[PDB]
Amino acid sequence: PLESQYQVGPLLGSGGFGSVYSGIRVSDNLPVAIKHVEKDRISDWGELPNGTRVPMEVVLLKKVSSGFSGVIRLLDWFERPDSFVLILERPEPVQDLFDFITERGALQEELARSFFWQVLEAVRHCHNCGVLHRDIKDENILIDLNRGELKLIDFGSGALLKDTVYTDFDGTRVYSPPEWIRYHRYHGRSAAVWSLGILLYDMVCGDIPFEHDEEIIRGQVFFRQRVSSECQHLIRWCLALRPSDRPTFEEIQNHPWMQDVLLPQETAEIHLHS
């Protein structure tokens, strides 16, 4: 019954995703995030096993809800006359990867390795559960600063994972692959790998490689910071113009740059001062 369950706090953020508030679960003082989405602004709608009409986001979150801490967890949701309200886990203290990179600059490679591996494990979990996120980027990744653990957030542009072609997209253009820009056609996993290349470059360089369609299409990658030969190779591989030339998730995690990753806790002790 909503009001008697949560104590609503300050606005955490807003945007294409909705409006997200800090909240507390009254029953156990649990930190939560309360995300509101207007029905009018809802892209596409889904399908609960019981068959009520909910936004796809709800569908996707439930499909990826489990013990695994690499993806945000949906705890409850409500329907209102003009909106849906999502109760989500909130780590505390937390900071997003965009803010982290803004505050700290280009990340040491040891750190970018730990973070990127964890992103890979989380996207693999999504795909495994039939979910394609479709907006992988620094802003949609939270860092649980205590545990050195990353969380994927905002599945509001996601879809069910299919093996046929997608002709629709509404994630972040600068993270979208050349085949979306040129043809308005992509395949889930290979588009995901492209965005993973953009994000890796973002971590090691402190900014994204392309701002304009022409740059995305041309595919030429310039390194503005000192980046190791192996990291450069991995990044350029993910950012292959032909989708079919892109690494599989397995090929990425077998890549030599990806060897000897730190544990999340190790990562926090060293790089998060914990």
Side-chain angles (χ1 to χ4, degrees), residues 194-206:
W194 173 275
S195 75
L196 285 164
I198 300 296
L199 166 70
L200 179 44
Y201 184 106
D202 181 54
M203 289 174 202
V204 294
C205 284

Side-chain angles (χ1 to χ4, degrees), residues 97 100-101 104-120 141 143 148 150 196 199-206 226-228 231 234-235 252 257-262 267 270-272:
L97 184 59
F100 182 86
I101 284 157
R104 300 179 41 154
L107 308 185
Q108 289 188 18
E109 280 183 31
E110 190 185 67
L111 177 55
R113 182 182 301 113
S114 164
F115 277 10
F116 190 66
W117 182 269
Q118 287 190 60
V119 170
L120 300 185
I141 292 167
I143 304 166
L150 277 57
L196 285 164
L199 166 70
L200 179 44
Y201 184 106
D202 181 54
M203 289 174 202
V204 294
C205 284
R226 163 66 208 193
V227 182
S228 69
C231 188
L234 184 49
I235 289 170
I252 294 173
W257 184 74
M258 289 260 62
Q259 298 171 127
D260 300 301
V261 79
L262 291 178
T267 308
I270 303 169
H271 296 287
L272 277 16

Side-chain angles (χ1 to χ4, degrees), residues 209-268:
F210 312 134
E211 304 288 347
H212 295 107
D213 290 352
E214 309 88 77
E215 303 181 85
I216 298 172
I217 283 168
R218 176 167 183 257
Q220 181 75 211
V221 184
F222 171 85
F223 285 88
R224 56 193 86 189
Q225 299 274 317
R226 163 66 208 193
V227 182
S228 69
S229 293
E230 273 167 4
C231 188
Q232 284 197 27
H233 178 278
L234 184 49
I235 289 170
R236 286 192 168 92
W237 199 11
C238 295
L239 295 183
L241 289 186
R242 284 212 290 161
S244 31
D245 283 337
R246 279 168 219 161
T248 52
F249 284 84
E250 179 181 5
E251 281 164 330
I252 294 173
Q253 295 185 287
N254 283 334
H255 190 283
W257 184 74
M258 289 260 62
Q259 298 171 127
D260 300 301
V261 79
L262 291 178
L263 301 187
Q265 200 38 91
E266 256 150 29
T267 308

